[PDB]
Design an enzyme around this catalytic site. Structure first.
Site, mmCIF file in Angstrom:
data_model
loop_
_atom_site.group_PDB
_atom_site.id
_atom_site.type_symbol
_atom_site.label_atom_id
_atom_site.label_comp_id
_atom_site.label_asym_id
_atom_site.label_seq_id
_atom_site.Cartn_x
_atom_site.Cartn_y
_atom_site.Cartn_z
ATOM 1 N N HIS A 97 0.819 -1.221 0.000
ATOM 2 C CA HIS A 97 0.000 0.000 0.000
ATOM 3 C C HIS A 97 0.843 1.257 0.000
ATOM 4 O O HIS A 97 0.291 2.357 0.083
ATOM 5 C CB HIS A 97 -0.996 0.060 1.172
ATOM 6 C CG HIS A 97 -0.364 -0.013 2.529
ATOM 7 N ND1 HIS A 97 0.392 1.010 3.058
ATOM 8 C CD2 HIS A 97 -0.450 -0.957 3.500
ATOM 9 C CE1 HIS A 97 0.788 0.678 4.273
ATOM 10 N NE2 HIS A 97 0.271 -0.499 4.572
ATOM 11 N N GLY A 155 3.548 5.907 10.332
ATOM 12 C CA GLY A 155 4.930 5.914 9.927
ATOM 13 C C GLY A 155 5.692 4.662 10.281
ATOM 14 O O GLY A 155 6.765 4.433 9.712
ATOM 15 N N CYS A 204 4.531 1.721 9.662
ATOM 16 C CA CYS A 204 4.165 0.676 8.721
ATOM 17 C C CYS A 204 5.392 0.286 7.915
ATOM 18 O O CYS A 204 6.226 1.130 7.582
ATOM 19 C CB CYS A 204 3.034 1.134 7.810
ATOM 20 S SG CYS A 204 1.478 1.133 8.720
HETATM 21 C C1 ODN Z 1 0.582 1.889 7.415
HETATM 22 C C2 ODN Z 1 -0.814 1.852 8.004
HETATM 23 C C3 ODN Z 1 -1.244 3.185 8.603
HETATM 24 O O1 ODN Z 1 -0.537 3.905 9.259
HETATM 25 C C4 ODN Z 1 -2.664 3.493 8.140
HETATM 26 C C5 ODN Z 1 -3.159 2.086 7.717
HETATM 27 O O2 ODN Z 1 -3.528 1.248 8.796
HETATM 28 C C6 ODN Z 1 -1.923 1.540 7.006
HETATM 29 C C7 ODN Z 1 -1.752 2.258 5.672
HETATM 30 C C8 ODN Z 1 -2.551 3.554 5.595
HETATM 31 C C9 ODN Z 1 -2.474 4.402 6.861
HETATM 32 C C10 ODN Z 1 -3.492 5.583 6.931
HETATM 33 C C11 ODN Z 1 -4.859 4.951 7.232
HETATM 34 O O3 ODN Z 1 -4.883 4.309 8.529
HETATM 35 C C12 ODN Z 1 -3.589 4.213 9.154
HETATM 36 O O4 ODN Z 1 -3.762 3.538 10.348
HETATM 37 C C13 ODN Z 1 -3.202 5.664 9.456
HETATM 38 O O5 ODN Z 1 -2.065 5.781 10.311
HETATM 39 C C14 ODN Z 1 -3.066 6.470 8.153
HETATM 40 C C15 ODN Z 1 -3.692 7.896 8.261
HETATM 41 C C16 ODN Z 1 -2.930 8.693 9.333
HETATM 42 C C17 ODN Z 1 -5.180 7.858 8.652
HETATM 43 C C18 ODN Z 1 -3.541 8.591 6.909
HETATM 44 C C19 ODN Z 1 -4.122 7.784 5.763
HETATM 45 C C20 ODN Z 1 -3.480 6.416 5.631
HETATM 46 O O6 ODN Z 1 -4.132 5.730 4.552
#
Ligand code: ODN
Ligand code: ODN
Lengths: 301, 301
Positions: B41, B143, B145
């Site tokens: 992703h 961050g 992830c």
């Molecule tokens: C790496 C994860 C993460 O930090 C995410 C998701 O769970 C996953 C990819 C996308 C991230 C988001 C959506 O949810 C998250 O928990 C969140 O930290 C992220 C935000 C801050 C909501 C921004 C959009 C992103 O798609």
């Protein structure tokens, strides 16, 4: 959500761990630039430990009686000295993996990571606190002596601890990297009992702030209190007194949560007087005091 | 004495962490030989995450749309592919710090260390367990992830986990290093609820063995029990059933302590039915299930 006791990444310290042998005694040393640091009781036999005269014992040791091994490389010792309770061995090679570093002496209640080692080899890393009685609740079998505790700020390792002894209670005592013990302990096999191990109040409050940030709010109560009135309760429960310095260190957490420090103190009070009645905070059934206010900011902002 | 949740020394993994950017999304990648591994992703916008078609989204990406940074060195991407939910980016340089390593898919209940990273930079290390519902109770803000979980055997890193998602409950879901999720979770922002998070019985028993080895024996009781009778109680308390495989894995701890596994099961039973009445085991007011039998042998023999 998510709050873990986290240790610092250990790689910068892994590159400094070596094995130090003197006669039949071996322990861990710390190799920074062209000096190896280790507990001076490396020169003691098991029988010397009951009443060592370190000056007299060291007189009988030459540079070539100190075997220092870094992985499979053996280092040439060109000098040796005693600084308080630490032995400094000058070697002919600077450690190429020497990180930026400083030697610091921490306060009770501050936290740091220990890289537990055996015979110079890293085995594990864990986070702990200097207890108010200057002991460390470690995980150290025979052979981890000389393991070091540290904090990392950006690219700089602040070494704050060297494990020297296991007390008869099983708890650990050590020195800073200048060889001065934390607390009254000495490097001798003798009766050594630690004082009362009080709870680090300012750390417990920081951890309650972390719980609120993470959604655990049930303990948030409806009372407030005063600093004198809180310390009254804290003294009864063997909690360290809270000072205005501690209130100020908690300032950023009070600002993030909108919860005044004295309000948090009143919830803590209620928890000390009532218990938790079987519920948990951040997955724990007891109040946790090995997170400093900075540790919480580190992991929650 | 002394028992700590310990993580593995992280240095071997620190040398593999890199930053991966695609467009405006950045996360952590893992650089081993001439391939960088990261959650697919990374190619999604915040709006793509609700219903990604990864094949279609990846079609629109070329090698030069992937920015991979290792410290301050930027790596040249010469290829890219998708393996299940992981992106593999071929780079023109083999990582000189590549350790000996393998990719393994762990079982529920097994433990491993996570090196939490942000933008390619190691920030902390902690030990956890794969929960029986295939979630991980992590410490991960936006961050982290792409952070990875691992075990170390001698000089070999077994990578077992890559963090991909935070579920609406705040718990984490991830994949093995082949990109296959643990559990039913998917890399999409949608309703995803985990099953019941049961307690890892064989780990709790290992931890009770560690307590006995360390002097905590008050819970040692005078009853025994049978495997069927114990699982009867374990089912009521949302504990995983104990099998004869688990009994056999506990074999070395029963031999070290002279306490038969079924005797330990009967003490556990009594603790589940009576609570701990306010006392502690190894400093904990609840039963701990993030130590495997091997973890206990590692730290107690
Ligand atoms: C790496 C994860 C993460 O930090 C995410 C998701 O769970 C996953 C990819 C996308 C991230 C988001 C959506 O949810 C998250 O928990 C969140 O930290 C992220 C935000 C801050 C909501 C921004 C959009 C992103 O798609
Ligand atoms: C490094 C420490 C250690 O392991 C010691 C002491 O606490 C200190 C140096 C000497 C070690 C002993 C004595 O007590 C220890 O706790 C113990 O582990 C050592 C034994 C195993 C008893 C052997 C003698 C040695 O002096």
């Amino acid at each position: 959500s998510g709050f873990r006791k986290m240790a610092f990444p250990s790689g910068k310290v892994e590159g400094c761990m070596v094995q130090v042998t003197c006669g039949t005694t071996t322990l861990n040393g710390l190799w920074l630039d062209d000096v190896v640091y280790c507990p001076r009781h490396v020169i003691c036999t098991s029988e010397d430990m009951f009443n060592p005269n370190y000056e007299d014992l060291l007189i009988r040791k030459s540079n070539h009686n100190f075997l220092v091994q870094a992985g499979n490389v053996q280092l040439r010792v060109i000098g040796h000295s005693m600084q308080n309770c630490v032995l400094k061995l000058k070697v002919d090679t600077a450690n190429p993996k020497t990180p930026l570093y400083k030697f610091v002496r921490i306060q009770p209640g501050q936290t740091f990571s220990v890289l537990a080692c055996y015979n110079g080899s890293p085995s594990g890393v864990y986070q702990c606190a200097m207890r108010p009685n200057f002991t460390i609740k470690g995980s150290f079998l025979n052979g981890s002596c000389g393991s070091v505790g540290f904090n990392i700020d950006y690219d700089c390792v602040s070494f704050c601890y060297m494990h020297h002894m296991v007390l008869p209670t099983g708890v650990h005592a050590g020195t800073d990297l200048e060889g001065n013990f934390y607390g009254p302990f000495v490097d001798r096999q003798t009766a050594q009992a630690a004082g009362t191990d009080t709870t680090i109040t300012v750390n417990v409050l920081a951890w309650l702030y972390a719980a609120v940030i993470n959604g655990d709010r049930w303990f948030l109560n409806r009372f407030t209190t005063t600093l004198n009135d809180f310390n009254l309760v804290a003294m009864k429960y063997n909690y360290e007194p809270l000072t205005q310095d501690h209130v100020d260190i908690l300032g950023p957490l009070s600002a993030q949560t909108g919860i005044a420090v004295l309000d948090m103190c009143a919830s803590l009070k209620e928890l000390l007087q009532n218990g938790m009645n079987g519920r948990t905070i951040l997955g724990s059934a007891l109040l946790e005091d090995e997170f400093t206010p900075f540790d919480v900011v580190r992991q929650c902002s």
